[PDB]
Structure formats: C-alpha cells, structure tokens
C-alpha cells in the first residue's frame, strides 16, 4: 500500500486558505449550500389560464438534463429529506388591465390535479405588483427519506399545484429547503455536451 507524494508542497491548507483571499471572495467547503441557491431550470414555461397545473408535470423533464444543481447532483445520490423552494418570476406581456393573481396550493407528488379537493394552505401573489412567487413547499411525506425518482410515489410526498388565471410565461428556479440534503453516495452518470451537425 505504498503511497508517495511529490513536490514537498507546504501545508495545502495554508496556501488555499490564503489563496482565496487572493482570487475568491467566498470560501466554499460544504456542498449542500448549492441546494440553498436558486438557479433556474426553465425560462419560458408558457402556462395556460384558469388551469391549476401541477409542477411534477414540469419537473419530470427537469431532472433529466442537469440544467440546475438539484438534478445534476441527484445522480450522485438516491435520496432526499427536504423541501424544494420554487420561485416563479413572470415575463408575460401583461401590458393589460386585467388582474393576475397567480395562486399556489399543495398537492401530493404524482397526483394529476383532477382527483383533488384544492383547499388547505395556499398563496397568492400579483405579478403586476410583484413578479415573483416564492413558496417553500416543506417535506410532509411519511417516510424517513425518498428515492430521487422512482415510479412508486402515489402520495409519498407533497407538491405544488400551481394555479393561475391567465395565459402566462414564467421563469423558474428551485434550490431546496433549509433542511434539504441527499442520502447515500453513489457513482456518476455520463455527460453529453456540444453537438456538430454535418
């Protein structure tokens, strides 16, 4: 088990802890804080009017590309124990006189918004006054943890049921709740990048 070392470098945690005050205002040592930073997944998500549309119907073609961290890192792991703050900005041409009152609700994951009594906690924000919507859906499942993406989720967790009254285009972002981490560690996926037609 002979393991050697080159360069007789000084204390590595003497140069970097010094060579961030020269190069990096921030000094990152954890990784979980990424899940507290909202970076977007979609940029249009053109919605429809007076149709409560769940979010799982969106975030299923979201955890398949890694356009954020909450997905790119998913593969590394399998489980999670927290809530997913979903922030929704508006870009719709609301140069009109109507009153948009985009409304959010709570629905169990993998329910289709048609078999639901839409009551309970909610939220209503007006884009004409505040072009955001910054809910903090908590973790109200009944299990210690949850597989990242399986097909047996007939209510093992909570979700959004985003409601609106107008035909809208939204920007979106999602990081995770103050108690949102992942479970086991596993290996890595395969990545594709740039493509060159010919």
């Amino acid at each position: 088990e002979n393991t050697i070392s080159f360069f007789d470098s000084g204390d590595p945690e003497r140069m970097n802890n010094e060579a961030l005050m020269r190069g990096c205002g921030e000094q990152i040592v954890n990784l979980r804080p990424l899940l507290r930073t909202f970076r977007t997944i979609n940029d249009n998500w053109s919605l429809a009017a007076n149709t409560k549309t769940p979010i799982t119907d969106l975030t299923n073609t979201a955890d398949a590309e890694g356009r954020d961290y909450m997905s790119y890192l998913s593969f590394l792991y399998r489980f999670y124990r927290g809530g997913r703050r979903y922030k929704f900005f508006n870009t719709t041409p609301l140069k009109q006189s109507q009153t948009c009152y985009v409304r959010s609700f709570l629905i169990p994951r993998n329910y289709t918004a048609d078999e639901i009594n839409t009551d309970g906690p909610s939220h209503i924000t007006y884009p004409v006054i505040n072009p955001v919507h910054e809910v903090e859906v908590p973790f109200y499942s009944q299990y210690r943890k949850i597989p990242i993406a399986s097909t047996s989720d007939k209510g093992y967790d909570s979700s959004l049921m985003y409601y609106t009254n107008v035909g809208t285009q939204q920007i979106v972002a999602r990081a995770g709740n103050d108690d949102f981490t992942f479970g086991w560690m596993i290996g890595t996926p395969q990545l594709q990048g740039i493509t060159k037609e010919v």
Binding site: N17, M21, E26, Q27, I28, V29, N30, L31, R32, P33, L35, R36, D178, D179, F180, T181
Partner: peptide, 17 residues
C-alpha cells in the same frame, strides 16, 4: 478574514443551514 473565521469554527452555515 470573515468567511475564514466561520470555516475554522465549522459553524452551521457552511454545511447547508
């Protein structure tokens, strides 16, 4: 030295809180 004061105390922020 601020963030270098928290990284050394291992405060509950860096770990994701």
């Amino acid at each position: 030295v601020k963030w270098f004061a928290d990284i050394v105390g291992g405060v509950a922020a860096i770990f994701g809180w």
